[PDB]
Amino acid sequence: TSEKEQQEAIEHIDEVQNEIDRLNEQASEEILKVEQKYNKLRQPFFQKRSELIAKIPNFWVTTFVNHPQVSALLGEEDEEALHYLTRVEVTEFEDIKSGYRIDFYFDENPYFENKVLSKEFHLSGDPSSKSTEIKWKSGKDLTKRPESFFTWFTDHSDAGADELGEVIKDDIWPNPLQYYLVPDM
Amino acid sequence: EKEQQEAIEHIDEVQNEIDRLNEQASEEILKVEQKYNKLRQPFFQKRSELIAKIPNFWVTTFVNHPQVSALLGEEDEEALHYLTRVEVTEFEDIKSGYRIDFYFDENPYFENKVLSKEFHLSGDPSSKSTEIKWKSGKDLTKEPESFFTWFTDHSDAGADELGEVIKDDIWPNPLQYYLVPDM
Ligand SMILES: [Ca+2]
Ligand SMILES: [Ca+2]
């Protein structure tokens, strides 16, 4: 093959591979549309699940206590605070890549005045996170002398390496029932 | 008890329906991959013809690949000189598995015209390869283990890194690795 002919072939290959890239980019769009369709399709069922969960005392504290990774993040008084956690929600943003948000809904409690505690994650791919400010009632669990579970809300250094955020989103939220249930004899 | 064990049963029923919706999404996504597999196939075909006009295309692609480069010994590169064509075929239903074909020209190392390794899913991950008919005094028996031992490795069938790298990374776009920027 000629020295020119090879560079002609390389030019042809580049043109063929641009169309394969186009075909790949169009497939990954169609796939994201399918995820967006089933995100809305599942959301009423998660809505139904939350209502049933809210009639089960200590559901979410128990799931967390029996989870192999999250259990180690809970102190003694953290569990007392999580008693008041009635509802956990996870919301992927529409385009999915943008990021996701996690909501912890609390009943009136001795620790803080917030009705909801949230932590959201954002992505070019520049990982960031931002949380609601916890209005503690002169009983901050993070300024008492182990590190409290609730410091997670004020931690933003890892952002893209937020392990707990990923475990709640990918593991606990899809199926919390496995951890709540304890096999008896 | 009446309430909790009923609620636990209700929760299980709702999550059974979520699993059903998940299974229905993974079907619809599988249809999209099958549609675009057929659309890409004529372009891979034309690419194959253009590649066969390029000496040492696949050896160079492998040598410049961050993971596969470490799998090549010195004499492995000499053998891969004769690799004219690489093909990847996902089976129609996708779940069944896929096959990778390596087409060689007549070479001093083995008599095979094609070397293949296919991956299958009872539903246990499995793989099978063509038997390499090495010639007298050329083999994989001694660098670390030769590149060609990949063909005879079948323990981690579901965890075949090289197979997944070729299928998902190198096969879609080998040109990026062949091309080296000059200044
Ligand atoms: Ca359990
Ligand atoms: Ca390159």
Short mmCIF file of C-alpha atoms in Angstrom, two decimals, chain A residues 9 16 19 23 29 40 48-49 78 83 91 120 122 124 148 162-164 168 183 185:
data_model
loop_
_atom_site.label_atom_id
_atom_site.label_comp_id
_atom_site.label_asym_id
_atom_site.label_seq_id
_atom_site.Cartn_x
_atom_site.Cartn_y
_atom_site.Cartn_z
CA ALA A 9 -7.55 5.01 4.34
CA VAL A 16 -16.64 6.10 9.21
CA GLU A 19 -20.77 8.21 12.00
CA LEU A 23 -24.92 6.39 16.15
CA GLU A 29 -30.03 9.60 24.12
CA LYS A 40 -41.99 8.97 36.26
CA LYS A 48 -47.24 4.53 47.82
CA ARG A 49 -44.30 2.83 49.60
CA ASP A 78 -27.81 9.54 66.54
CA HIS A 83 -36.29 7.72 65.67
CA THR A 91 -34.92 12.22 43.48
CA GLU A 120 -28.10 17.41 46.88
CA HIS A 122 -24.29 18.21 41.33
CA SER A 124 -18.32 18.88 32.57
CA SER A 148 -22.00 12.15 64.55
CA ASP A 162 -19.74 10.72 48.83
CA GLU A 163 -20.01 7.04 49.69
CA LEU A 164 -23.12 7.35 51.87
CA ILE A 168 -28.61 5.43 49.97
CA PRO A 183 -35.03 -13.28 60.50
CA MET A 185 -36.59 -18.43 64.86
#
